Design a protein around this ligand. Structure first.
Ligand code: A1AGG
Ligand code: A1AGG
Lengths: 300, 299
């Protein structure tokens, strides 16, 4: 079978806390003796439209930040700002702090989101960083500070923290250094993204997964050159496929005996002809939020 | 709308591995009991048609290797309940959540924590199909992985994984060891009944579309429940039960559209098709979001 699968979220759940300043409440990430959260928690209504964050932050005291881990209040003993994230230093270390690191992911890469409200985890799902640096998340009011992550062995690699929804309903945020993905800004304004494109190497991975699970109606007898495929792919607002992408698809190619450029010829036919009512792995649309690695691990 | 799983940490803290000879699967460690599929006691060649009672009579506590990670939990008692093994262990799980064992209905959804050798690998959302299979993602060694829902702080355990069918869907039991559907834990070819579309969930999905301002498909007609069920079966949709009508209640109230009026709108979509339009960015009607799922993501 094949499902959109998230990493188990327990190691991240034990880091989540609630952070309040004024009448604003969102989530923080508690690692060792530091809590990370979106800086716009210091903003009032009158601040949110053009917040001069350095100016607003210097006027705040440690005691203006109310941090709660379940029943317990954590005492803030210092605060600083790193780009769009606030670092609240606390007098107590999180014992549940896992082995972790902070990474900035590339567009087309995937990661799990642990959506939280008032510091309590509510759900977990899988996302990709879109080529236009938005994410198609499920985030309501109160979800800021929810984080996205990958787990390699015993290590949690944090790659996203949530800050906002765009008018189109997609979402935008930062890495754990507080740098936004994309051309967005932590002010209360309607912001449009650049035109999105489809993550081709991931569509190809998913087609291979469909074959591994017995679905093959979209295959064809034809091949294509890499450049002629890319010409068609760009026409349809699909990302170009690089030779590194081709190399990454090798394992999936070997396992199934379908040359990458044969699968590209299939995808080209799907783009030109559409799906003619049919479905692949349940979907009526071509899915682009599985990486080759995602498909490999899940299918062995 | 995403498929969203429950946070899995409370269940991760309960996963262990259980080994008999070379056969290793997963178990669920709550208080001082470990729950797992009984077929752990079967050699690969025993699985063709096992005599579970006779295989268990030859077993002693000291034939069972239970491990949390690499740490052995000594087994101090054992009993078979339907198709699961209960192994009493000498340590109460310090991470035991508040929990319940529940038997769910077809159509209901739940999160699966896929595990191998006692270690969680992934979590995803499943629906229990009307033919009592699930469209899971499971490899060798996944048995004893569990499906669950979390209400407030209480984990309601509803599924334990035992097997894959010829069509590549999956079958298992509740935590009392009773299979969902007409399957047995024997390495024999078995067939699921023909599957049907989960009508209550499709209706939930239509409510979700209305809540988001997508309401072209609403019409001025209504229907009886019986007339709707008889029409729906002709399109291989499940009949609605009284419980289905009940769990659509909150979405009915939220939108002010009576359940039976939404049924009349769906009947017209069945009878006339989408005429080329979409609902919620899709020509397909989705059937694996329950009314609870719709609430979790809209409000
Ligand atoms: C933090 O919890 C919250 C998360 C948001 C809330 C809705 N969904 C989410 O993911 N973040 C915020 O509220 C942002 C705070 C800023 C960065 C100071 N703002 C935000 O997400 O605004 C969302 C709304 C939805 C529609 C839209 O365009 N905007 C932007 C603000 C706005 C401008 C003009 C008109 C209406 C809204
Ligand atoms: C337990 O980890 C394992 C999980 C399986 C492994 C592959 N995917 C899964 O979900 N369960 C088992 O191996 C089952 C043990 C029995 C119930 C004692 N058996 C099982 O899953 O058999 C699967 C195979 C795949 C093809 C097929 O038809 N079957 C069923 C039995 C069978 C019939 C005919 C020919 C070969 C096997």
């Amino acid at each position: 079978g094949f499902r959109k699968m998230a990493f188990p979220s327990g190691k991240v759940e034990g880091c989540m806390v609630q952070v309040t300043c004024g009448t604003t409440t969102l989530n923080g990430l508690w690692l060792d003796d530091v809590v990370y959260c979106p800086r716009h928690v210091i903003c009032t209504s009158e601040d949110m439209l053009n917040p001069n964050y350095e100016d607003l932050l210097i006027r705040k005291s440690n005691h203006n930040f109310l941090v709660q881990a379940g029943n317990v209040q954590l005492r803030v003993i210092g605060h600083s700002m790193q780009n769009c994230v606030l670092k609240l230093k606390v007098d107590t270390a999180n014992p549940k702090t896992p082995k972790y690191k902070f990474v900035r992911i590339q567009p087309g890469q995937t990661f799990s989101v642990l959506a939280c409200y008032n510091g309590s985890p509510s759900g977990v799902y899988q996302c990709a960083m879109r080529p236009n640096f938005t994410i198609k998340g499920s985030f309501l009011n109160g979800s800021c500070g929810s984080v996205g992550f990958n787990i390699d062995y015993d290590c949690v690699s944090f790659c996203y923290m949530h800050h906002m929804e765009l008018p189109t309903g997609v979402h935008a945020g930062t890495d754990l250094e507080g740098n936004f993905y994309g051309p967005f800004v932590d002010r209360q304004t309607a912001q449009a993204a650049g035109t999105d494109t489809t993550i081709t190497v991931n569509v190809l991975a998913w087609l291979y997964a469909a074959v591994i699970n017995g679905d093959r109606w979209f295959l064809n007898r034809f091949t294509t050159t890499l450049n002629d495929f890319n010409l068609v792919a760009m026409k349809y607002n699909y990302e170009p496929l690089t030779q590194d992408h081709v190399d990454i698809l090798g394992p999936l190619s070997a396992q199934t005996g379908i040359a990458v450029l044969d699968m590209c010829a299939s995808l080209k036919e799907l783009l030109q002809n559409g799906m003619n009512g049919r479905t692949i792995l349940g979907s009526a649309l071509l899915e682009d939020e599985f990486t080759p690695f995602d498909v490999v691990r899940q299918c062995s």
